[PDB]
Structure 1
Amino acid sequence: RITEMVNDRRIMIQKLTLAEKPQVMRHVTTEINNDLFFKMSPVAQLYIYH
């Protein structure tokens, strides 16, 4: 997953040892939409100023 993202950077990761490939780990990624904060609000001027 890390080596397959396409961006401005070339990611290189040394190949994993045949034994150390199953090793488990936890990586929590949030799944939530952020588009509901950017509506039109009666306090938008306050947001801009602050």
Structure 2
Amino acid sequence: RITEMVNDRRIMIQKLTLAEKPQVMRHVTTEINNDLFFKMSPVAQLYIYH
């Protein structure tokens, strides 16, 4: 998911060892995409200026 996130080839992500592939982590409930950012338009000007 992170690799698909960062489309730039200059960035390269650490490779995973065989023993580290099946390890388990906790992810967030819902991801932050452009959808959420589009909904802050009425107040975006203040944030940009500051």
| TM-score, scaled relative to structure 1 | 0.44
Q: Which runs of 5+ in 1 are unaligned?
A: none
Greater Rg over alpha carbons, structure: 1
Q: CA RMSD in A?
A: 4.9
The structure with the greater share of residues assigned to helix is: 2
Percent of paired sites with the same residue: 100
Higher mean displacement: 12-21 or 33-42: 33-42
Measured in 2, the distance between the counterparts of 1:4 and 1:37 equals 19
Q: CA 1:17–1:30 in structure 2 vs 1: closer, same or farther (change >3 Å)? A: same
Q: Which runs of 5+ in 2 are unaligned?
A: none
1:3 and 1:13 in contact (8 A); partners too: yes
Q: CA 1:31–1:38 in structure 2 vs 1: closer, same or farther (change >3 Å)? A: closer
1:32 maps to 32
Residue 28 (structure 1) shift: 1.4
* Number of matched pairs: 50
